[PDB]
Design a protein around this ligand. Structure first.
Ligand SMILES: *SC1=NC(C)(C)N(O)C1(C)C
Ligand SMILES: [Cl-]
Ligand SMILES: [Cl-]
Ligand SMILES: [Cl-]
Ligand SMILES: [K+]
Length: 164
């Protein structure tokens, strides 16, 4: 297991434009295209992201290319954020992946707002951090995925992704 395999499990792989769990146009391995309700706007974003006229369909290689860019972008967002970088730096590699996963799903600013959870993670109070992370819109709207990410923070193991 690693961050790529982890997010591939959590996000799936679809080669045609679909709506994510928030209703937003998405493609590939959880590549968010736009929050606009306009499918034409989403298709325009897709063509710009891939560099050709796709008509809303891409290949597996193209999906994996966007995915690698998106994982890279999540890590860069952590490293440039004054609240996320100290927590990231304090974590082992397994828990770092859990933080990258959250930033991939909700964005840098969204995760940086989890001030009390971040403090508990910085303090390595793992059970308390896990409890606090579940008091969230995130957990209520995507509980099975949040439970996997939270278990990864609680234990520092890949047990929540093992048989998947
Ligand atoms: S939430 C929560 N915090 C403690 C560690 C006290 N718990 O046992 C729960 C209920 C999981
Ligand atoms: Cl330490
Ligand atoms: Cl709490
Ligand atoms: Cl709550
Ligand atoms: K998805």
């Amino acid at each position: 297991m690693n961050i790529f395999e982890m997010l591939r499990i959590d996000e799936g792989l679809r080669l045609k434009i679909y709506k994510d769990t928030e209703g937003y146009y998405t493609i590939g391995i959880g590549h968010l295209l736009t929050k606009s309700p306009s499918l034409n706007a989403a298709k325009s974003e897709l063509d710009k992201a891939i560099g050709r006229n796709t008509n809303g369909v891409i290949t597996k290689d193209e999906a994996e290319k966007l995915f690698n860019q998106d994982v890279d972008a999540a890590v860069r967002g952590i490293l440039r954020n004054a609240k996320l970088k100290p927590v990231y730096d304090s974590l082992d590699a397994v828990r770092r992946a859990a933080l990258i996963n959250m930033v991939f799903q909700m964005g840098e600013t969204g995760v940086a707002g989890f001030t009390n959870s971040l403090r508990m993670l910085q303090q390595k109070r793992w059970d308390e951090a896990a409890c606090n992370l579940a008091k969230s819109r995130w957990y209520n709207q995507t509980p099975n995925r949040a439970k996997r990410v939270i278990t990864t923070f609680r234990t520092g193991t890949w047990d929540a992704y093992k048989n998947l």
